[PDB]
Design a protein around this nucleic acid. Structure first.
Ligand code: ZN
Length: 56
RNA sequence: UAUCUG
C-alpha cells in the first residue's frame, strides 16, 4: 500500500499577481528585508522531491 | 487549515 493520511487534492495554479514583490522583499513569507533564498522560514531545500526530468 | 512566482 501507499498512503500518509487520506488527502486527495492537486492543483498547479495560474493567474496570481506577484503583489508588490520588492527587489528587496521576500517572495515566500512576504517579508521585507530578506530574500526568499534567505527566508528565515525556509527550513531546508530544495523542496518538492519530483524526479521529473522532462520539461526544459 | 501545505508561501522560494524575483
Ligand atoms: Zn521570507
Amino acid at each position: 500500500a501507499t498512503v500518509v493520511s487520506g488527502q486527495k487534492q492537486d492543483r498547479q495554479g495560474g493567474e496570481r499577481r506577484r503583489s508588490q514583490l520588492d527587489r528587496d522583499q521576500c517572495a515566500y513569507c512576504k517579508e521585507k528585508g530578506h530574500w526568499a533564498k534567505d527566508c528565515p522560514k525556509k527550513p531546508r531545500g530544495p523542496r518538492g522531491p519530483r524526479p521529473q526530468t522532462s520539461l526544459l
